[PDB]
């Protein structure tokens with residue numbers, strides 16, 4: 281019951297080259313299965329999967345988190361908060377089959393890193409070593425955030441993941457990717473136009489679009505723009521709160537700053553709860569398919 285310690289353990293004999301191969305397999309499949317979700321591709325859902333398998337972490341007792349790769353167990357993959365993520369897991373199945381040596385946690389997190397980079401986002405340093413843990417270590421449902429809340433809720437929620445205001449605003453920028461699907465979350469619509477290209481569009485849209493608070497077909501309120509975009513109440517709270525607003529403006533006006541801050545916050549999210557040995561390998565920075573000429 282005491283605060284357990286999760287020590288990163290490198291998959292036996294593996295090094296950078298091995299993980300670059302897994303990265304490449306994921307990236308090649310992202311390119312191949314381009315028709316998914318009306319041609320948005322699997323990039324966005326893989327990022328969401330990485331964030332939800334990591335977002336269960338509780339700094340207070342080190343339960344949940346990316347280390348154990350517990351999403352593979354029914355209790356967690358059936359979490360209502362994870363509806364739709366099965367698509368990401370299905371995508372990674374053939375990858376895990378080809379590289380059975382990689383842990384589930386390493387695969388889920390690497391999937392998110394690969395997706396961000398392939399979608400032209402910033403490089404995200406990634407460390408290996410997550411080790412699969414038993415089904416009884418699977419966190420209970422209810423640790424992921426609700427979308428119908430305000431800024432105070434968001435701020436308090438993220439304190440459990442040890443994220444401050446800047447980290448929260450930076451992480452939310454991932455919503456430039458993909459869209460909400462009524463059947464999955466009770467919300468419908470994309471946050472922007474370039475659904476599968478990682479940019480700071482989320483912030484520009486929050487500030488520049490003309491938003492109207494409306495009710496969707498699930499009878500839930502969401503902010504809609506004439507451009508056909510939407511914002512969840514939690515997204516919109518970032519411009520209602522004065523502290524969050526200042527940061528949103530910063531990122532809307534500095535693409536490089538957003539990339540650097542997102543990279544740090546995303547790696548931190550994916551590494552929360554993990555203790556890396558003094559002699560563990562340095563973080564890996566994978567080359568994109570484009571950089572490799574593949």
Ligand code: HEM
Nearest residue numbers: 324325327328331426427451454457458459460461464465
């Ligand atoms: C207050 C926190 C957050 C809330 C309430 C929230 C809520 C949601 C909801 C309701 C969806 C739609 C799911 C669906 O209908 O398919 C979604 C999608 C998504 N979220 Fe968030 N999210 C939050 C934070 C984040 C963070 C921190 C990241 C990652 C850094 C992230 C990345 C994504 C991505 C990429 C999608 C698109 C998935 C797809 O298109 O299939 N989210 N989120």
